[PDB]
Amino acid sequence: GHLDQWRSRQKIGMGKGARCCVICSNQKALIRKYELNVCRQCFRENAEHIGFTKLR
Amino acid sequence: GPLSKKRMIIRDGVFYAELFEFLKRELAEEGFSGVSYHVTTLRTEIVIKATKTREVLGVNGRRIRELTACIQQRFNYKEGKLQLYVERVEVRGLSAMAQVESLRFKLLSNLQVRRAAMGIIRYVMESGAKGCEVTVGGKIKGQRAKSMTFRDGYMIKSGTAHKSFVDSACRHCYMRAGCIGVKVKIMLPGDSTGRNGPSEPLPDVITVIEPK
Amino acid sequence: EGQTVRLTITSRNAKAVESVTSQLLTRARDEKVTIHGPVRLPTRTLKITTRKTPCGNGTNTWDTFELKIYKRIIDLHAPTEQVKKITSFTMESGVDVSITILD
Amino acid sequence: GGKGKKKKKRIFTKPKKPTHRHKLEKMRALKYFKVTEYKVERTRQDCPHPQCGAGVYMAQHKDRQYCGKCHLTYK
Amino acid sequence: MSTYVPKPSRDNVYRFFFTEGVIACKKDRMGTWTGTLGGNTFTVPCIQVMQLMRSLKSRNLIKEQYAWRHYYWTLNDEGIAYMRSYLHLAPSAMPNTQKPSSVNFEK
RNA sequence: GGAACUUUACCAGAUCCGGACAGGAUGAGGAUUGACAGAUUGAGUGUUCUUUCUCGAUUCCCUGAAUGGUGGUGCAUGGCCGCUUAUGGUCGGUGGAGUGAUUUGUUUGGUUGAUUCCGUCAACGGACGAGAUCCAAGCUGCCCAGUAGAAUUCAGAAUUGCCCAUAGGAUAGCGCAUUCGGUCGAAUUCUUCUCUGCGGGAUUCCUUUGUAAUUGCACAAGGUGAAAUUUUGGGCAACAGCAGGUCUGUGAUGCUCCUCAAUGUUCUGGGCGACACGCGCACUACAAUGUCAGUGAGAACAAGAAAAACGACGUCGAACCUACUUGAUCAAAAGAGUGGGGAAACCCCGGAAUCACAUAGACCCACUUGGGACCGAGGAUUGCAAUUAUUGGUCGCGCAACGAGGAAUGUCUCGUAGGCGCAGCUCAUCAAACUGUGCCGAUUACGUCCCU
Ligand SMILES: [K+]
Ligand SMILES: [K+]
Ligand SMILES: [Mg+2]
Ligand SMILES: [Mg+2]
Ligand SMILES: [Mg+2]
Ligand SMILES: [Mg+2]
Ligand SMILES: [Mg+2]
Ligand SMILES: [Mg+2]
Ligand SMILES: [Mg+2]
Ligand SMILES: [Mg+2]
Ligand SMILES: [Mg+2]
Ligand SMILES: [Mg+2]
Ligand SMILES: [Mg+2]
Ligand SMILES: [Mg+2]
Ligand SMILES: [Mg+2]
Ligand SMILES: [Mg+2]
Ligand SMILES: [Mg+2]
Ligand SMILES: [Mg+2]
Ligand SMILES: [Mg+2]
Ligand SMILES: [Mg+2]
Ligand SMILES: [Mg+2]
Ligand SMILES: [Mg+2]
Ligand SMILES: [Mg+2]
Ligand SMILES: [Mg+2]
Ligand code: NA
Ligand code: NA
Ligand code: NA
Ligand SMILES: [Zn+2]
């Protein structure tokens, strides 16, 4: 039915569509290193809180 | 198995950033100035720093219990594993977060930008700050946006020691015309114990001991 | 001689991890247990490099964010009750102490 | 290129499809029950699926004896 | 995938919302939200929970906060008053956040 | 921004309301929800239809409203970034000068990368930037190792002196001969190598028949030394601006547009890749200072698995990376089995490629064993899906240009240029990209204001 078809492709959970920023839900330019799963723009704003600092 | 050390610190940092953002959005009217936590084998002991201690607390701890329930449900804390405490900020004027929120409230109360910014600057310096800088930008006079900066006292900008000697905060103001950015920078004075200072002289200051 | 207990102290703050390590060593010396020695494991640097701009315009400048991880280990031959007594004190925030029994 | 996100409002070849609505069956229990003067009988068969509410009456369509929940058609 | 929330699920979410004064739900449109009631476990789709809370918010029965893809809904005085009337709970019944504290949240 | 679907904003179509709430009409034997089968359809899609079940007061129904939007407007904005601008610049207070805009301070001169200093002085005191601070590298002290190593002593083993090659040169050995990370030995002892939280160490410190000085600030050679001038390389970085970029990062945002056959949201398919052509930036080459086929010695920075899910009976156990074995009684790529690693612990004694070889190896100046573009056939692998080749591997194709490139033009001064690989990052699968890392390692200048 329509429920079965609804979001069937998304239920697969592979590719860029499955992933998203844990802060802003954007799916573009996601940082997956160390399983941060934060988009680069969000990471720059929240870098100090996470623990990173701008050395060299 | 158990997470590696790299993953553990990443998880701790992400949790702290989420906790800070939630508290900043929730306790905006209160002078929320920071949060700390200390995980032990017994509980978590999240400590929230604010200026309006009774307001964040609520009546009989009603609001603080509500915040504890929010944090417990969000991070799936077990019963008797999360505990929240409220601590008052020692000096209101030396906290940039408190002052920028106060400036946001003043601007939403439809006050003159110059008068509100000067009032913030005045209170900051009476508090004991070495200097204060306030920035207001956006659609103020009319359609054409403009940014005005009000300064007083000392303020350092370059190097790395400025991060330890300057407290900075920025906030968004939603007016009828549009968004207004407010920034407060406070040159913290020296403190003996580091509660309201870096507990160290300026990086370019040399003092010669008076002979005895 | 007896069973060996491993104290793993890890922290993002170098000052905090050093103070906790010194306090643990001093308490162990008070209890007169035979400690091997506080070994400083190599410091690990988490590096994230990102483009400064949020839109992709202008000179392609980058931000290098670094997070340093400090780890220490202390080995002592004490009963689990004694190690619990030594470990039982007020630590700094952001410091992790782990208990491991060597075989 | 083209106009950015503009309602073209094209012409539809196929006529607009209606929207499905529930077909009312007045006094459905009256047709299900067969009260012979009084022993009430169930004209529709009871459900053979225990998980899907064992005892809920199936349908009586021509050549099909399906149910609403389990969809266990008999033919 | 449907917002046609069953009534038994509604009062189950309602029972949890009265027991614990707040509800936290991730803003995932294909996830499931888990509660506790009084010791058991029940799961209801997140889309149904958001629809129920949107109705409560539109009636001014709750306050809503959002941060990092997570909702936080908290019942105000009108919300709990309507909460008791709907559940037919005993009078003077208050959530865990409103029961006698006897706990010091200072320093 | 390396797009097969998703991303995705585009195109051709079909779904859902994810239009809350408020007021009306409707509604208990029914406001509605969801569907068997046949047919409608791209859809063994209740999408709609025929037929009936099922659901149940959750919802339709229509009016306002609301909601969402990678819809517009970056010439309405915030935030951030880029640029002006890698240079030494910037601003009050009080006092002097001017009717005033304004000026002095902020300068003749010398010196410094430096508005850096000396000195002078209608200015005197201040503030920012520069410097300092911070991170990394080179030397070094304490600490320290059962997640790093080393040296002896007993055992256990191996070579063992007469041997000079196919033609066999050059190159240290002249009380005790060497070797054995599987010998998965046993005792001792230790910190030379390694790990690192704080320290130390370099500053014009020392010396000139020096430059200058008749004062100073300094400069140049040499000395000392691991390091001799901002030690080296980065990070940070004032004040004024730009109608620079971004509404395609955000639950950042005014105004405005669409809103139930929608510019919301899903699903299917196609496109973002499509080629007479022009341009930026890369990769591979044009070969003998080479290409093949062997053999040897040998880096560094780094990454590695999962839950309020599921299986097992509040704990593991499978997602990730690897080693070994097998496949193997016969290609590669595969496919399997076992073991280890939460990462100084397994990978790993990290056998990287440049490189080296007296390898007595093949080729011998030719579009040739240079160059692999284009294309054909088999097979395997990732994925829900490989056609418009996903990507490896095999045999063909090499008769595709290309033999060093016109006018023009980019970057660069020391472990640098150039070459050479490796890791991370995008990542189910795919680096000619980027971010870092090490290896081999020069020519030239250390000058000028001719060009910009
Ligand atoms: K004046
Ligand atoms: K081939
Ligand atoms: Mg300065
Ligand atoms: Mg500087
Ligand atoms: Mg691709
Ligand atoms: Mg596509
Ligand atoms: Mg599509
Ligand atoms: Mg609706
Ligand atoms: Mg859209
Ligand atoms: Mg948006
Ligand atoms: Mg602009
Ligand atoms: Mg802007
Ligand atoms: Mg434009
Ligand atoms: Mg002037
Ligand atoms: Mg413009
Ligand atoms: Mg807008
Ligand atoms: Mg493109
Ligand atoms: Mg060669
Ligand atoms: Mg060839
Ligand atoms: Mg496909
Ligand atoms: Mg093939
Ligand atoms: Mg050829
Ligand atoms: Mg790229
Ligand atoms: Mg010139
Ligand atoms: Na003046
Ligand atoms: Na020397
Ligand atoms: Na993004
Ligand atoms: Zn984000």
Short mmCIF file of C-alpha atoms (C1' of nucleotides) in Angstrom, two decimals, chain F residues 68-412:
data_model
loop_
_atom_site.label_atom_id
_atom_site.label_comp_id
_atom_site.label_asym_id
_atom_site.label_seq_id
_atom_site.Cartn_x
_atom_site.Cartn_y
_atom_site.Cartn_z
"C1'" G F 68 6.86 23.06 5.23
"C1'" G F 69 10.14 24.64 1.22
"C1'" U F 70 18.29 23.37 -1.37
"C1'" G F 71 11.29 29.25 -3.91
"C1'" G F 72 13.14 34.44 -4.88
"C1'" U F 73 15.90 38.72 -2.97
"C1'" G F 74 23.69 38.06 -0.15
"C1'" C F 75 21.39 45.45 -3.40
"C1'" A F 76 16.66 43.97 3.17
"C1'" U F 77 20.03 40.95 7.27
"C1'" G F 78 22.78 38.10 11.25
"C1'" G F 79 26.90 34.71 11.56
"C1'" C F 80 31.12 33.07 9.09
"C1'" C F 81 34.70 33.53 5.25
"C1'" G F 82 37.50 35.95 1.29
"C1'" C F 83 39.79 40.49 -0.31
"C1'" U F 84 41.71 45.48 0.26
"C1'" U F 85 47.12 43.92 2.96
"C1'" A F 86 51.69 40.59 4.53
"C1'" U F 87 52.88 44.67 4.53
"C1'" G F 88 53.54 48.25 9.40
"C1'" G F 89 49.83 50.32 10.14
"C1'" U F 90 45.51 52.70 13.68
"C1'" C F 91 43.02 55.91 17.61
"C1'" G F 92 41.59 58.86 21.93
"C1'" G F 93 42.49 62.35 26.30
"C1'" U F 94 44.77 67.06 27.71
"C1'" G F 95 47.91 70.82 25.69
"C1'" G F 96 49.98 73.87 21.08
"C1'" A F 97 48.37 75.89 15.80
"C1'" G F 98 44.04 77.33 12.28
"C1'" U F 99 37.67 81.38 11.25
"C1'" G F 100 37.28 76.26 9.58
"C1'" A F 101 37.63 71.52 7.17
"C1'" U F 102 41.96 69.96 9.57
"C1'" U F 103 46.79 69.59 11.90
"C1'" U F 104 50.63 68.47 15.78
"C1'" G F 105 51.42 64.07 18.75
"C1'" U F 106 52.47 59.90 14.47
"C1'" U F 107 59.27 63.74 12.93
"C1'" U F 108 65.40 65.72 10.44
"C1'" G F 109 68.56 61.70 10.59
"C1'" G F 110 70.45 56.63 11.43
"C1'" U F 111 68.87 51.67 12.50
"C1'" U F 112 65.02 47.35 12.33
"C1'" G F 113 60.92 42.59 8.71
"C1'" A F 114 58.51 46.16 11.92
"C1'" U F 115 55.28 53.54 13.98
"C1'" U F 116 61.64 48.09 15.81
"C1'" C F 117 64.73 51.19 18.40
"C1'" C F 118 68.22 55.55 19.34
"C1'" G F 119 67.81 60.53 19.01
"C1'" U F 120 65.35 65.08 18.08
"C1'" C F 121 60.98 67.71 19.24
"C1'" A F 122 54.63 71.96 21.14
"C1'" A F 123 53.89 68.34 22.66
"C1'" C F 124 52.81 65.28 27.26
"C1'" G F 125 50.67 60.92 28.75
"C1'" G F 126 47.98 56.56 27.02
"C1'" A F 127 45.38 52.36 23.82
"C1'" C F 128 45.66 48.53 19.72
"C1'" G F 129 48.65 46.33 16.00
"C1'" A F 130 54.22 44.77 15.56
"C1'" G F 131 57.04 42.17 19.37
"C1'" A F 132 55.63 39.09 23.34
"C1'" U F 133 52.16 34.71 24.13
"C1'" C F 134 50.68 29.59 21.82
"C1'" C F 135 51.68 24.83 18.82
"C1'" A F 136 55.25 21.72 16.26
"C1'" A F 137 60.78 20.41 14.97
"C1'" G F 138 66.17 20.02 16.09
"C1'" C F 139 70.02 19.30 21.47
"C1'" U F 140 69.31 18.24 26.52
"C1'" G F 141 67.64 17.15 32.57
"C1'" C F 142 64.19 14.60 35.89
"C1'" C F 143 60.56 10.63 35.48
"C1'" C F 144 59.47 5.87 33.19
"C1'" A F 145 58.19 1.03 30.99
"C1'" G F 146 55.12 -6.95 31.65
"C1'" U F 147 51.70 -1.49 25.55
"C1'" A F 148 59.75 0.65 24.61
"C1'" G F 149 64.24 -1.62 24.38
"C1'" A F 150 69.40 -3.18 25.46
"C1'" A F 151 73.75 -5.92 27.37
"C1'" U F 152 76.02 -10.19 29.84
"C1'" U F 153 76.01 -15.44 31.85
"C1'" C F 154 74.65 -20.48 31.62
"C1'" A F 155 72.13 -24.19 28.28
"C1'" G F 156 70.08 -25.78 22.85
"C1'" A F 157 71.41 -25.52 17.79
"C1'" A F 158 74.15 -24.05 12.79
"C1'" U F 159 79.02 -22.82 9.73
"C1'" U F 160 83.98 -24.45 10.62
"C1'" G F 161 89.76 -23.97 6.50
"C1'" C F 162 92.53 -28.02 1.76
"C1'" C F 163 88.77 -25.58 -1.69
"C1'" C F 164 90.01 -18.85 -5.44
"C1'" A F 165 83.70 -18.88 -10.54
"C1'" U F 166 81.85 -19.15 -17.04
"C1'" A F 167 86.43 -14.08 -17.50
"C1'" G F 168 86.01 -13.18 -11.08
"C1'" G F 169 88.83 -6.88 -10.58
"C1'" A F 170 88.45 -3.21 -6.58
"C1'" U F 171 86.76 -2.92 -1.26
"C1'" A F 172 88.40 -3.03 6.99
"C1'" G F 173 89.58 -7.09 10.34
"C1'" C F 174 95.79 -10.33 11.68
"C1'" G F 175 92.93 -14.11 26.82
"C1'" C F 176 88.62 -15.38 23.71
"C1'" A F 177 85.98 -17.65 15.60
"C1'" U F 178 81.16 -16.17 14.17
"C1'" U F 179 75.53 -16.98 13.79
"C1'" C F 180 70.51 -18.17 15.48
"C1'" G F 181 63.37 -11.72 16.77
"C1'" G F 182 60.70 -19.91 16.30
"C1'" U F 183 65.74 -21.82 20.44
"C1'" C F 184 56.90 -19.37 20.53
"C1'" G F 185 65.12 -21.64 26.13
"C1'" A F 186 66.43 -20.14 31.63
"C1'" A F 187 68.38 -16.71 34.85
"C1'" U F 188 70.39 -11.94 35.99
"C1'" U F 189 71.59 -6.70 35.32
"C1'" C F 190 70.38 -2.18 33.04
"C1'" U F 191 68.30 2.69 30.43
"C1'" U F 192 72.72 3.76 25.12
"C1'" C F 193 67.84 3.73 21.43
"C1'" U F 194 62.11 4.67 22.24
"C1'" C F 195 57.78 6.77 25.07
"C1'" U F 196 56.78 12.34 27.98
"C1'" G F 197 54.27 16.11 31.97
"C1'" C F 198 57.18 19.75 33.48
"C1'" G F 199 62.17 21.99 33.09
"C1'" G F 200 67.18 23.45 30.78
"C1'" G F 201 69.37 25.58 26.29
"C1'" A F 202 70.53 31.25 22.25
"C1'" U F 203 71.27 36.31 23.77
"C1'" U F 204 74.16 39.72 19.34
"C1'" C F 205 76.58 36.00 24.46
"C1'" C F 206 82.02 36.23 23.03
"C1'" U F 207 86.35 38.42 19.58
"C1'" U F 208 87.70 42.02 15.77
"C1'" U F 209 94.03 47.04 13.12
"C1'" G F 210 86.36 45.32 11.37
"C1'" U F 211 81.13 49.34 9.29
"C1'" A F 212 79.50 53.12 12.17
"C1'" A F 213 80.16 56.13 16.87
"C1'" U F 214 82.85 60.53 18.46
"C1'" U F 215 76.83 59.60 21.61
"C1'" G F 216 73.60 55.87 21.03
"C1'" C F 217 70.62 52.34 18.36
"C1'" A F 218 73.08 48.70 15.55
"C1'" C F 219 75.48 45.98 11.33
"C1'" A F 220 79.17 42.48 9.12
"C1'" A F 221 82.61 38.38 9.51
"C1'" G F 222 84.47 34.74 12.76
"C1'" G F 223 84.01 32.11 17.71
"C1'" U F 224 81.18 29.10 21.00
"C1'" G F 225 77.57 25.52 20.14
"C1'" A F 226 72.49 20.57 18.59
"C1'" A F 227 71.01 25.16 16.97
"C1'" A F 228 73.99 32.10 15.27
"C1'" U F 229 69.60 35.49 14.06
"C1'" U F 230 62.15 36.96 14.22
"C1'" U F 231 66.62 29.50 15.70
"C1'" U F 232 63.22 26.88 11.94
"C1'" G F 233 57.90 26.18 10.33
"C1'" G F 234 53.13 27.51 11.61
"C1'" G F 235 48.81 29.57 14.50
"C1'" C F 236 46.90 34.28 16.22
"C1'" A F 237 46.61 39.29 14.30
"C1'" A F 238 44.67 46.26 14.76
"C1'" C F 239 41.64 50.35 12.57
"C1'" A F 240 38.90 51.47 8.48
"C1'" G F 241 36.33 49.55 4.44
"C1'" C F 242 33.84 45.91 -0.29
"C1'" A F 243 26.54 46.90 -1.95
"C1'" G F 244 33.07 40.49 -2.62
"C1'" G F 245 30.76 35.22 -1.32
"C1'" U F 246 27.08 32.53 1.27
"C1'" C F 247 19.18 32.95 2.11
"C1'" U F 248 22.63 25.15 -1.50
"C1'" G F 249 25.26 24.42 6.55
"C1'" U F 250 21.65 25.13 10.86
"C1'" G F 251 15.03 25.03 14.68
"C1'" A F 252 20.04 31.79 11.88
"C1'" U F 253 16.83 35.31 9.62
"C1'" G F 254 12.85 40.21 7.64
"C1'" C F 255 9.89 41.03 3.17
"C1'" U F 256 7.96 38.09 -0.60
"C1'" C F 257 6.21 33.35 -3.54
"C1'" C F 258 3.87 28.22 -3.61
"C1'" U F 259 0.80 25.48 -0.20
"C1'" C F 260 -3.55 19.22 -0.91
"C1'" A F 261 -3.26 17.34 -9.66
"C1'" A F 262 1.77 21.86 -3.83
"C1'" U F 263 7.60 25.27 -5.17
"C1'" G F 264 5.70 20.75 1.05
"C1'" U F 265 6.94 15.18 1.26
"C1'" U F 266 7.64 10.36 -0.70
"C1'" C F 267 8.11 6.52 -4.68
"C1'" U F 268 9.38 5.05 -10.01
"C1'" G F 269 12.34 6.39 -14.16
"C1'" G F 270 15.57 9.73 -16.51
"C1'" G F 271 19.22 13.86 -15.93
"C1'" C F 272 23.24 16.35 -13.22
"C1'" G F 273 28.25 12.40 -17.13
"C1'" A F 274 24.78 14.21 -22.54
"C1'" C F 275 29.58 16.75 -27.82
"C1'" A F 276 31.40 20.27 -34.55
"C1'" C F 277 34.31 23.65 -30.32
"C1'" G F 278 37.13 27.36 -26.73
"C1'" C F 279 39.61 27.85 -21.76
"C1'" G F 280 41.61 26.72 -16.28
"C1'" C F 281 43.87 22.96 -13.36
"C1'" A F 282 45.96 17.74 -13.21
"C1'" C F 283 47.69 12.64 -14.73
"C1'" U F 284 50.72 9.75 -18.50
"C1'" A F 285 54.45 10.36 -21.98
"C1'" C F 286 57.69 11.13 -25.93
"C1'" A F 287 62.73 6.73 -23.95
"C1'" A F 288 69.39 4.06 -23.20
"C1'" U F 289 70.81 9.40 -16.78
"C1'" G F 290 65.86 4.05 -20.46
"C1'" U F 291 62.08 -0.11 -20.74
"C1'" C F 292 61.33 -5.18 -19.30
"C1'" A F 293 62.71 -9.90 -16.06
"C1'" G F 294 65.00 -10.91 -11.54
"C1'" U F 295 67.71 -10.06 -6.63
"C1'" G F 296 68.98 -6.91 -2.33
"C1'" A F 297 68.69 -3.19 1.57
"C1'" G F 298 65.08 -0.40 3.52
"C1'" A F 299 60.35 5.15 6.00
"C1'" A F 300 56.97 8.25 8.41
"C1'" C F 301 52.15 10.49 9.53
"C1'" A F 302 47.90 7.68 10.25
"C1'" A F 303 43.22 4.68 10.66
"C1'" G F 304 40.42 0.48 12.45
"C1'" A F 305 33.78 -2.99 15.15
"C1'" A F 306 26.98 -0.49 16.73
"C1'" A F 307 22.27 1.03 19.57
"C1'" A F 308 16.09 2.40 24.50
"C1'" A F 309 17.94 -2.28 17.43
"C1'" C F 310 18.30 -7.55 16.90
"C1'" G F 311 20.02 -12.85 18.44
"C1'" A F 312 21.86 -15.68 22.84
"C1'" C F 313 21.19 -17.17 27.72
"C1'" G F 314 21.91 -7.69 32.52
"C1'" U F 315 26.25 -9.37 30.50
"C1'" C F 316 28.40 -11.05 25.56
"C1'" G F 317 28.10 -11.19 20.00
"C1'" A F 318 28.04 -9.75 14.66
"C1'" A F 319 28.93 -5.20 11.85
"C1'" C F 320 35.49 -2.40 11.29
"C1'" C F 321 40.75 -3.34 10.27
"C1'" U F 322 43.98 -7.02 9.87
"C1'" A F 323 47.77 -11.63 10.43
"C1'" C F 324 48.16 -16.98 9.32
"C1'" U F 325 46.38 -21.05 6.72
"C1'" U F 326 43.64 -23.19 2.85
"C1'" G F 327 42.18 -22.78 -1.90
"C1'" A F 328 46.54 -25.62 -4.44
"C1'" U F 329 46.75 -32.83 -7.30
"C1'" C F 330 48.23 -26.35 -10.79
"C1'" A F 331 46.52 -18.63 -13.68
"C1'" A F 332 45.21 -13.93 -11.77
"C1'" A F 333 41.27 -11.87 -9.16
"C1'" A F 334 38.45 -14.76 -5.95
"C1'" G F 335 36.03 -17.74 -2.31
"C1'" A F 336 36.75 -19.93 2.51
"C1'" G F 337 38.70 -21.41 7.67
"C1'" U F 338 41.22 -19.96 12.24
"C1'" G F 339 43.50 -16.34 15.36
"C1'" G F 340 44.32 -11.25 17.05
"C1'" G F 341 43.40 -5.91 17.82
"C1'" G F 342 39.33 -0.61 21.31
"C1'" A F 343 44.89 0.32 18.83
"C1'" A F 344 52.90 1.97 21.62
"C1'" A F 345 49.48 -4.29 22.93
"C1'" C F 346 47.05 -7.31 16.61
"C1'" C F 347 48.51 -5.46 11.89
"C1'" C F 348 54.26 -4.75 13.07
"C1'" C F 349 60.92 -6.49 13.54
"C1'" G F 350 55.08 -1.69 9.75
"C1'" G F 351 60.11 -5.89 3.89
"C1'" A F 352 56.53 1.72 0.41
"C1'" A F 353 58.53 3.56 -4.04
"C1'" U F 354 62.39 6.54 -5.77
"C1'" C F 355 67.30 3.58 -5.06
"C1'" A F 356 71.01 -0.36 -5.34
"C1'" C F 357 73.07 -5.05 -7.79
"C1'" A F 358 80.65 -7.60 -10.70
"C1'" U F 359 72.28 -9.68 -12.39
"C1'" A F 360 79.01 -11.42 -16.14
"C1'" G F 361 70.01 -11.25 -17.85
"C1'" A F 362 67.08 -9.47 -22.63
"C1'" C F 363 66.47 -5.25 -25.71
"C1'" C F 364 70.22 -1.21 -29.17
"C1'" C F 365 67.98 4.35 -31.56
"C1'" A F 366 63.31 2.31 -33.90
"C1'" C F 367 56.95 5.43 -33.10
"C1'" U F 368 61.03 0.17 -31.19
"C1'" U F 369 60.37 -4.63 -25.90
"C1'" G F 370 59.27 3.90 -25.92
"C1'" G F 371 53.93 5.45 -25.14
"C1'" G F 372 49.54 2.86 -23.40
"C1'" A F 373 44.76 6.10 -25.62
"C1'" C F 374 40.64 3.51 -28.16
"C1'" C F 375 38.19 -1.09 -28.60
"C1'" G F 376 36.73 -6.83 -28.32
"C1'" A F 377 35.90 -11.38 -25.53
"C1'" G F 378 35.86 -14.53 -20.61
"C1'" G F 379 35.48 -14.31 -15.51
"C1'" A F 380 35.16 -12.34 -10.39
"C1'" U F 381 33.70 -8.54 -6.86
"C1'" U F 382 30.64 -4.05 -4.25
"C1'" G F 383 25.49 -2.92 -4.24
"C1'" C F 384 18.37 -3.28 -3.43
"C1'" A F 385 19.85 -1.98 -8.78
"C1'" A F 386 26.15 -1.87 -12.68
"C1'" U F 387 22.66 -0.81 -19.41
"C1'" U F 388 25.21 5.06 -20.35
"C1'" A F 389 31.31 -0.18 -19.56
"C1'" U F 390 30.89 0.82 -10.69
"C1'" U F 391 35.64 -1.36 -9.80
"C1'" G F 392 39.73 -5.22 -9.90
"C1'" G F 393 41.94 -9.44 -12.76
"C1'" U F 394 43.04 -12.43 -17.86
"C1'" C F 395 44.13 -12.62 -23.15
"C1'" G F 396 43.80 -9.68 -27.30
"C1'" C F 397 43.81 -4.26 -29.79
"C1'" G F 398 49.00 -0.87 -29.69
"C1'" C F 399 49.30 0.89 -37.49
"C1'" A F 400 46.03 6.98 -31.05
"C1'" A F 401 48.68 10.92 -30.97
"C1'" C F 402 53.17 11.85 -28.96
"C1'" G F 403 60.61 12.02 -31.09
"C1'" A F 404 60.66 17.59 -26.11
"C1'" G F 405 56.29 21.45 -27.78
"C1'" G F 406 54.83 29.06 -31.29
"C1'" A F 407 53.35 33.51 -29.16
"C1'" A F 408 52.89 33.55 -23.94
"C1'" U F 409 52.93 31.89 -18.77
"C1'" G F 410 53.08 29.56 -13.12
"C1'" U F 411 55.78 28.33 -8.59
"C1'" C F 412 60.22 28.42 -5.96
#
